[PDB]
């Protein structure tokens, strides 16, 4: 797990150990050995007079693990330099001792988030301008639309900011500055306050059938305070612990899995509670059709419900405890991308209310 922070550190640590040796041990005056010149690969202490010398491989490079006895075998001449290579003074240069699908996943990952962003601009402007659709049921769907268009924009930043982190310098140092560490709290939050706006759909729609409604003024301000405010209690406490105790490398590595069980375990509870509400509702939609093939009707309902209550993740491996790991993202990370179009089509354009609203509103303007 050799990482960036120690990459330049193991650079400065290894070399500085032998520029002490250069100061302590200058090149020999007998000239039987070779000159002590730091060729930027190894300081190269004096070796062997006309034969092979056994000097251990540079320890900072981890590739000495696969051969702990590996040595950099190089000949030297008794002329103050090495042998001649290509009519020039070069050292004994023989150092040899010490996937297509992953690139394709990127093309779909970034053509669905792009089109699931234009849909929620047209669908979020028609849903406001007509002034005849401001029922409370449409207040919950404005915030859901605004939680996706913020989710897509929270990912478009990551990849582009990753390219700039890889664009010669000793270290680009953008992983010393806070400009890296804050973007990946904005990102972790943005996808954590998006599974708590699918539990609000499961709770509002389920308190409308089984229980009776209890009030209005209290309800719409005990929903904005449970969808925008509960993450602040599972991201901020996680943000502090990766700066107060344990802080390195832009936190894209989470070795202590206890720490990644404070921002993940909670997501599982939201996925769970919103699985029971999907069985209970579809246990009712079949009771009305029974007492009224109609199996086709039942199917045409189930398929509409899955995109809003977002129960598809549980049907796929929920946590799945590896080719199987690659399989988990090929469809799952493609089903999550096109979810913007699925919701927008099924609740902004194939809606009966709106399709009349363009009919009426056009008869009175040309």
């Amino acid at each position: 797990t050799v990482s960036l922070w120690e990459t330049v550190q193991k650079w400065r640590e290894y070399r500085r150990q032998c520029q002490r040796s250069l100061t302590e041990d200058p090149p020999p005056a007998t000239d039987l050995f070779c000159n002590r010149t730091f060729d930027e690969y190894a300081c190269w202490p004096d070796g062997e007079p006309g034969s092979f010398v056994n000097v251990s491989c540079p320890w900072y490079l981890p590739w000495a693990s696969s051969v702990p006895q590996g040595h950099v075998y190089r000949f030297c001449t008794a002329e103050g330099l090495w042998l001649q290579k290509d009519n020039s003074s070069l050292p004994w240069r023989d150092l040899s001792e010490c996937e297509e699908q992953l690139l394709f996943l990127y093309i779909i990952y970034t053509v669905g988030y792009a089109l699931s962003f234009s849909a929620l601009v047209i669908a979020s402007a028609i849903l406001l301008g007509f002034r005849h659709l401001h029922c409370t049921r449409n207040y919950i769907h404005l915030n859901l639309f605004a939680s996706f268009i913020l989710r897509a924009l929270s990912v478009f930043i990551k990849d582009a900011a990753l390219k700039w982190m890889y664009s010669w310098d000793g270290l680009l140092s953008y992983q010393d500055s806070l400009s890296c560490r804050l973007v990946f709290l904005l990102m972790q939050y943005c996808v954590a306050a998006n599974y708590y706006w699918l539990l609000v759909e499961g709770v509002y729609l389920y308190t409308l059938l089984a229980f009776s409604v209890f009030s209005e003024q209290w309800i719409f301000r005990l929903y904005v305070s449970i969808g925008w405010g509960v993450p602040l209690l599972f991201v901020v406490p996680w943000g502090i612990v990766k700066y107060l105790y344990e802080d390195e490398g832009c936190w894209t590595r989470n070795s202590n899995m206890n720490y990644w069980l404070i921002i993940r375990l909670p997501i599982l509870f939201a996925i769970g509670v919103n699985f029971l509400i999907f069985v209970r509702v579809i246990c009712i939609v079949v009771s009305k059709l029974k007492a009224n093939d109609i199996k086709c009707r039942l199917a045409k309902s189930t398929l509409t419900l899955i995109p809003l209550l977002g129960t598809h993740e549980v049907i796929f491996a929920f946590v799945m405890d590896g080719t199987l790991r690659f399989i988990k993202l090929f469809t799952e990370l493609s089903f999550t991308s096109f979810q913007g179009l699925m919701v927008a089509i099924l609740y902004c354009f194939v809606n009966n209310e709106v399709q009349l609203e363009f009919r009426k509103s056009w008869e009175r303007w040309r």
């Binding site: 990459t7 990753l162 890889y166 010669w168 972790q188 894209t252 590595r253």
Partner: peptide
């Protein structure tokens, strides 16, 4: 939670290559 996993993969894979990129230029 694929976003917590896919971030690591593009991180670790393109990160360990730069270690070679750091050292392949070193001879040059």
């Amino acid at each position: 939670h694929g976003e917590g996993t896919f971030t690591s993969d593009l991180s670790k894979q393109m990160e360990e290559e730069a270690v070679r990129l750091f050292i392949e230029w070193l001879k040059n």
